[PDB]
Amino acid sequence: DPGFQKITLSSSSEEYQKVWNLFNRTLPFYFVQKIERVQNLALWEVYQWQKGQMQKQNGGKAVDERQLFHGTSAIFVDAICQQNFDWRVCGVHGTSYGKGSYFARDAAYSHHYSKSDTQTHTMFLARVLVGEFVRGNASFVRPPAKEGWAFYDSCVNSVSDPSIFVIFEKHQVYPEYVIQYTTSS
Numbered sequence: 001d002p003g004f005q006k007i008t009l010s011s012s013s014e015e016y017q018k019v020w021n022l023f024n025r026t027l028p029f030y031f032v033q034k035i036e037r038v039q040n041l042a043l044w045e046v047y048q049w050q051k052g053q054m055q056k057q058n059g060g061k062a063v064d065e066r067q068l069f070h071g072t073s074a075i076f077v078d079a080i081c082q083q084n085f086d087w088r089v090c091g092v093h094g095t096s097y098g099k100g101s102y103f104a105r106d107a108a109y110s111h112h113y114s115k116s117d118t119q120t121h122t123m124f125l126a127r128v129l130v131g132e133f134v135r136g137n138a139s140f141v142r143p144p145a146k147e148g149w150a151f152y153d154s155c156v157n158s159v160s161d162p163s164i165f166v167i168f169e170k171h172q173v174y175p176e177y178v179i180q181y182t183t184s185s
């Protein structure tokens with residue numbers, strides 16, 4: 001009906017533990033209170049179609065695909081689950097690696113973007129087709145051309161050790177899990 005569901009997971013399920021393990025990797029002192037699997041077939045189908053397209057233009061390489069974090073306010077959760085992340089809601093300004101949506105390797109970095117008035121913070125785990133990346137820059141509205149030739153698929157803070165990714169194309173992201181956690185108890 002709304003085109004999506006959010007399915008609360010059991011903490012005894014291995015699916016839960018996989019998500020929790022990744023969060024806990026860098027926020028081990030916080031307390032996960034719920035994890036919901038985002039179920040949106042249309043966003044999944046388009047993402048899988050994009051991955052397929054990237055595989056065809058890749059020169060036989062695997063498409064670089066990562067589970068990355070995105071901190072947001074609870075107010076945006078259902079919007080993201082239905083329409084995907086959209087960087088133009090509030091816009092981008094300040095320290096840019098480009099005008100696109102941002103994702104972090106470490107949960108710990110996304111904490112700062114999980115605004116709350118309350119003790120309960122909310123963060124997404126997303127499936128991101130990062131592909132081939134180059135360092136970002138504030139003026140970028142797309143990834144730049146590769147040298148010669150073709151374009152990069154994403155931008156990062158560091159080619160040698162990337163921890164922040166910017167995506168300019170929503171078909172390269174699938175919102176996977178909503179993680180609710182507390183900093184207290």
Ligand SMILES: Nc1cccc(C(=O)O)c1
Pocket residue numbers: 069070071072102103104105109110111113163164165
């Ligand atoms: N890495 C990175 C940079 C900026 C915002 C975020 C986020 O979690 O929203 C992540």
